[PDB]
Every structure is written in structure tokens, then in C-alpha cells.
């Protein structure tokens, strides 16, 4: 059981209230508004988690 | 590549020059944000006195 694969992931801590979380995407394409999926090599295998 | 790098974007402290023929300019006229960005306009008079 790898302790990679299942851990939480942190994306965005509490903004502690005022003010509110205000993001402003000029550029909106979707790896920008929904976020990226990398992928690490090890010995060449390709893994995500 | 598998997993790229976020490069943070970094300050802009340059100044564009653009440089073009009257109808190259008026293909980018028609963008308000071009009028809003390139505020300063030099007119090469085609012909001198």
C-alpha cells in the first residue's frame, strides 16, 4: 500500500473569512479553470494520483 | 511532458513598440482592448514638404 495514492490532496486553505475567495481567470481555458492532472515517472511507468 | 512546471508569471516592465502598415494596425484596430493598451499613435507622413 503505497502512501501516495491515498492521501488528501491540499488544494486551497480557508481564505479566513473577508474577503472572500475572489479569483479572476483572464485566461480561462480549462487547465486553468479546472485544474491539471500530472503524472510522475519512475523507472518510465507513468503514474497519477 | 508528464508533469510540467507552473511557472508563476512575473512582473511586465516593458514598453511595446509596435511597428506596421496602416491596414496591418487596422486589422487589430477593431479590438477594444488594443485602443485601451496602445494609446500612442505615430503617423509616418507618406510624403515629406
Same mark, same amino acid.
Given at each position: 500500500?503505497? !502512501?501516495?495514492?491515498?492521501? %488528501?490532496? &491540499?488544494?486551497?486553505?480557508?481564505?479566513?473569512?473577508?474577503?472572500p475567495?475572489i479569483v479572476?481567470? !483572464?485566461?480561462?481555458?480549462? %487547465?486553468? &479553470?479546472?485544474?491539471?492532472?500530472?503524472?510522475?515517472?519512475?523507472?518510465?511507468?507513468?503514474?497519477?494520483? | 511532458?508528464?508533469?510540467?512546471?507552473?511557472?508563476?508569471?512575473?512582473?511586465?516592465?516593458?514598453?511595446?513598440?509596435?511597428?506596421?502598415?496602416?491596414?496591418?494596425?487596422?486589422?487589430?484596430?477593431?479590438?477594444?482592448?488594443?485602443?485601451?493598451?496602445?494609446?500612442?499613435?505615430?503617423?509616418?507622413?507618406?510624403?515629406?514638404?
Open positions: 500500500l503505497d !502512501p501516495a495514492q491515498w492521501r %488528501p490532496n &491540499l488544494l486551497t486553505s480557508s481564505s479566513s473569512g473577508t474577503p475567495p479572476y481567470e !483572464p485566461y480561462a481555458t480549462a %487547465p486553468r &479553470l479546472f485544474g491539471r492532472l500530472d503524472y510522475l515517472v519512475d523507472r518510465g511507468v507513468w503514474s497519477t494520483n | 511532458a508528464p508533469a510540467g512546471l507552473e511557472v508563476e508569471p512575473f512582473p511586465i516592465q516593458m514598453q511595446v513598440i509596435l511597428v506596421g502598415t496602416p491596414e496591418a494596425f487596422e486589422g487589430l484596430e477593431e479590438d477594444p482592448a488594443f485602443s485601451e493598451l496602445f494609446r500612442i499613435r505615430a503617423e509616418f507622413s507618406p510624403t515629406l514638404p
